[PDB]
Design a protein around this nucleic acid. Structure first.
Lengths: 138, 125
RNA sequence: UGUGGACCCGCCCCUUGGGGUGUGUCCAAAGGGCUUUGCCCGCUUCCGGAUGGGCCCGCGUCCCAUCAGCUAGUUGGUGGGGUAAUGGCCCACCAAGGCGACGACGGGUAGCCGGUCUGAGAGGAUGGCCGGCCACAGGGGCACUGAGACACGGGCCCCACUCCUACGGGAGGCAGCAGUUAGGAAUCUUCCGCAAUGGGCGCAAGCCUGACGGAGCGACGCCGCUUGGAGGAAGAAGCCCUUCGGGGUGUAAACUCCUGAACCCGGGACGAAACCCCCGACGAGGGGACUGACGGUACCGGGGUAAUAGCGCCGGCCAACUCCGUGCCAGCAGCCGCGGUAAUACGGAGGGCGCGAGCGUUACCCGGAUUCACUGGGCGUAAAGGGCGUGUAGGCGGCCUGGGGCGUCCCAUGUGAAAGACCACGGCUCAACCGUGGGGGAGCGUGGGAUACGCUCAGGCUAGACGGUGGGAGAGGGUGGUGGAAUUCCCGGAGUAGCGGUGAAAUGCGCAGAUACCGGGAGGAACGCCGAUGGCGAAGGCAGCCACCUGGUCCACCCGUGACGCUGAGGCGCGAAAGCGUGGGGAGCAAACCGGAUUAGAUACCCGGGUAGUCCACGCCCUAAACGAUGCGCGCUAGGUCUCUGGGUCUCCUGGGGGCCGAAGCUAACGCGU
RNA sequence: UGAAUACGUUCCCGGGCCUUGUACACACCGCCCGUCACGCCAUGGGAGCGGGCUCUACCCGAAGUCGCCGGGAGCCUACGGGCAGGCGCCGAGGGUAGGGCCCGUGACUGGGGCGAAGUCGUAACAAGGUAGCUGUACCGGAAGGUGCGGCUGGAUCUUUCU
RNA sequence: UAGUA
RNA sequence: AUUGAAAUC
């Protein structure tokens, strides 16, 4: 069936990037879309777009890396080095605005779902609202 | 273990226990000797290691070691026990405090003096 | 007498017994002093205020499931009793309930908190002193008085104990302060004072107060301070090394100057101004008087003496090394380890390191220990996957929309006592100690608000699951039946001196004619070749051939239902071999046992026999290297190659299995790697 | 002066390179297991005498509150009632009988841990000299041995001990 | 046979 | 005595 659609997505992304795929699908949900636009806006993915594959909605995610590196092993640096689910269906996680974590002296980000909607941590700090600590990236 | 598991079961405080039943905490206990013997040690060592059996005010009866280079202890001696094992004498898990009760300090003992219970000599004074 | 209040009844508001009103009933009182006709201290009834309590409810509050079922005032009701008041609190009667894996009942342990210690934190540990609550007052009940008690220094009875006793009967209760004794490793003075603060009674003067405020003892803790300061040899002696020149203790001492802890004399507190008196008015305000335990202490001024140092350690961890003594002795040791004639590890001396009125030791708590892992761990071989399934509760849940707003989030507000911690400023010469002020804070209550996620309700959808039709391989299971090979035995023919067995033998069997050979028959057990690196099953496991009964699974079409899903504590079922019960069967094999060998022996390995057992029926047993030593499901992440079984356009593609090599990655490595 | 013999490398001894297995590293003159014997230590079962908690049933039941009586049977009276006193329920505790549990002691007794050089063998580690481990079952001074089935976590195309 | 690389 | 021992003369 699938137990965590979001966590699965972060993974699909995680997995694709380490073999340096140019693209991945992930079956489509509006909540998935909302997370994607953050990655997109915050510079981790080139972007997503909707497609229908074998007749059903997916989101084609376009990944984004670094320049071919110098010595032995020229594999590019990852743009997404670390994407990680936090609030799993087993143990749901909620920070209030006072407890919103700052991922990696700011160089990171924490997608975080609120009643004002899906937000980065700074977005949500600024809007002054906590919620379900979704995951974190950097 | 899954979280649900931890929620159902929790973790468990290992709390391993005393190396010294000198009972009631008790930093020391008073005892009366029963038997003063001499013991062959073990593992890779050899010597005639001195040690007493002690009847305890805690109701116990334990073998305790007699430190110092020579001693004044015989059957009904009445003594104070301090704990601290020997190691080369298996089953000896307490020491006798020298210089308390009928256990004299050690004679002609100049260096580590507060242990061995030997008062400051005035010979250099 | 009734301002008023109580009670029945009626009505009104209000909503649990809250407020109001109306007939009826019922209920008050105490006097005392004077600066005696005007005040003071009191009395009575009522409404209210403040303070202190009783009771009830939500959440939180240790260990054992080797405690799994508990319950008769038990759970509820109706009516009474009782209380200030609710209530099975108690009683009568009616009903048959109530509680439990979200851990009841039972056992063990324990006063709880503010906080304290520790930790980066989360957490752990803890509850002494001070503050809050509780409970107890030799052990057990009980009530009386009263605003309040079921009362530490009030009462009654039973118990144990101690004293009095004319043996009939009495008295008592330091877990108040001291002190005694006992237990113990261990814990203080039978001190001074009510001067202050506070409490009781009193109009007041005052009286009482082991609350208290002080002194005493104990390095028990924290803080401050002292044992001197400046000079002073290429360096006294003594002791320690030494390669015999030298090196060290060492500016250390001796010695010269200087300051002057202790001690002497002088002076000398704050803490104490109220109650009280007088004036005013017994008010406000003003004036006056008394009073200090600590104490002739603190502090100030003068004089003045060079005036205490110990304990631990020096192999590594860990900072500090040489010489004698000793010879697995004596001894050391926190762990690793030192000692057997050159010991930086033992004992000693010199020296050195570390602390210093202390230094060590032992005990205990947190730490390090991400070594119970929430933050923050794991299980192929290291400890660790349940022998396998079925599915109970429980956990977890696909895509779209709308409602509710329980989780979650935000704002406001209330609470979070004091002390403590923290920051400032301040008061004792500093500090320890102390004071004043400030700052936060989870958690919970109240009002408002948000709706992404989780929850729930109402619809939808088809990608998960299930189903339909068509096709496939299979030692998957159960029942009956049948086939050929071989062994053993019986019968016959033929035939003769041995066979058998071993490393070699021997036991054994053979002239009652065995072995070898041909023919017939009986009986049991197992199925050669195909046979595979193969197939099936959830495991255990499953192998001639046939028939019937039956489980699972795979593919194609993309037809149906509409999330119906995954997992699964307990439960139940299955579970090799051995073993057990009852009853059969019994060829071959074979624990035990009986023999023969071998051997130093040989309860063994080799040989000859041989019972249980292996086979069947039924019922038990429930284990294993029950092994891939790898739990189930789902998504994702290069390929090559071998193979079993489907489908398709058939050199290849596309499913589902079985294998190997190997991308990324993983692993301590070996390895693992759709 | 002056031989004989060497096919051959299976065996004995010493050695060289590759590989394998290893529980050895003092390095096979290695390691190591169990009984028995000796000595310290803690512990388990244990009939009977003793010490307590607890449960049920039956009986006796102080103090006290409460309930009834309170009389021609006593004291007070304004005759309304009060007090003494009596009876009763409950009740601290106690007694009899029966189960469940803890504490101690406990003759006889099961093993276990540890201890510089005791005894018998040689199980295991190399194919450990019969590959080893294993569930079970029988047997034997001792390690063990055999039977049935399983596992690979086995190498390989005459004789013990240090 | 015990300690001992 | 041998080797530091245990054993052993």
């Amino acid at each position: 069936m699938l137990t965590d659609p979001i966590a699965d997505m972060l993974t699909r992304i995680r997995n694709a990037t380490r073999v340096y795929k140019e693209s991945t699908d992930v079956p489509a949900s509006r909540f998935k879309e909302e997370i994607l636009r953050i990655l997109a806006r915050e510079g981790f993915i080139k972007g997503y777009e909707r497609v229908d594959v074998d007749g059903k909605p997916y989101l084609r995610v376009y990944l984004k890396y670094g320049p071919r590196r110098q010595g032995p092993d020229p594999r590019p640096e990852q743009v997404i080095h670390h994407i990680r689910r936090i609030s799993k269906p087993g143990r749901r996680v909620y920070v209030g605005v006072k407890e919103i974590p700052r991922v990696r002296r700011g160089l990171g980000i924490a997608i975080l779902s609120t009643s004002k909607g899906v937000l980065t941590d700074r977005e949500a700090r600024k809007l002054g609202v906590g919620g379900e600590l979704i995951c974190e990236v950097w | 273990p899954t979280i649900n598991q931890l929620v159902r079961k929790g973790r468990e405080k290992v709390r391993k226990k005393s190396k010294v039943p000198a009972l009631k905490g008790a930093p020391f206990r008073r005892g009366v000797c029963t038997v003063v013997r001499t013991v062959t040690p073990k593992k890779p060592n050899s010597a005639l290691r001195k040690v007493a059996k002690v009847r305890l005010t805690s109701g116990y009866e334990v073998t305790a070691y007699i430190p110092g280079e020579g001693h004044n202890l015989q059957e009904h001696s009445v003594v104070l026990i301090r704990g601290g094992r020997v190691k080369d004498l298996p089953g000896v898990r307490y020491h006798i405090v020298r210089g308390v009760y009928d256990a004299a300090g050690v004679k002609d003992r100049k260096k580590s003096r507060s242990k061995y219970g030997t008062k400051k000599p005035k010979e250099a004074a």
